[PDB]
Hints:
2 chains, A: 5 helices, 5 strands, 38% helix, globular, B: rod-shaped, Portal protein (chain B)
Amino acid sequence: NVETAAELSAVNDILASIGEPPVSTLEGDANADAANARRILNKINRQIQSRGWTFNIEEGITLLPDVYSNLIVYSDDYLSLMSTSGQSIYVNRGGYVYDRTSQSDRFDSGITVNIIRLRDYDEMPECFRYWIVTKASRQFNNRFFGAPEVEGVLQEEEDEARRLCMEYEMDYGGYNMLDGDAFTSGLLTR
Amino acid sequence: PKEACPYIPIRMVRLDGESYGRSYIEEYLGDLRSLENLQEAIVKMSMIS
């Protein structure tokens, strides 16, 4: 890809757990440590935006198929896609979306989906940046520099980072039981 | 004549400057409907059992 000013700091903070800073990571066949930590970083990004958060689940989004091909294209960018209400009828098949109830593939009109789109290490909150850096540091610890005590402290500190980031999500987007949901909004109409 | 009108319009609870009447059940409607919901669930929650 392209260098990012925050992402090099992330790959540096992965190697802040073990050893020395690399520089700028902009070569494929390169420093093996930098590309290796960068692969761990993008995997923890793809996993940490996978779980579903209230700033990530773009709620009523509409996808549109190609005009010639008549087929809307599932992507690896499309991280996990579900339907709006319940009993979600959309699944990936070939690289294309597919109805498991209509038993069909071609779509005439658009489609309304709760989708998650893959974002970078940038475009995330700082809570989640610290959580991806610390969980990827735990993974990079466990897979290459196998030392026990630094694994214990990164496990404890991942738990603290997830504590903070669940505090962020229960603070981002105030969810109230009796005045905001779909069931007991109506029960309290006088 | 003015007093012996055979069409008698009857209101239950009158209000000023208002051509019609409002029922007596209206005034206790909400605690009525709050019963409804609160009771509804119970029957539904029974059926799960």
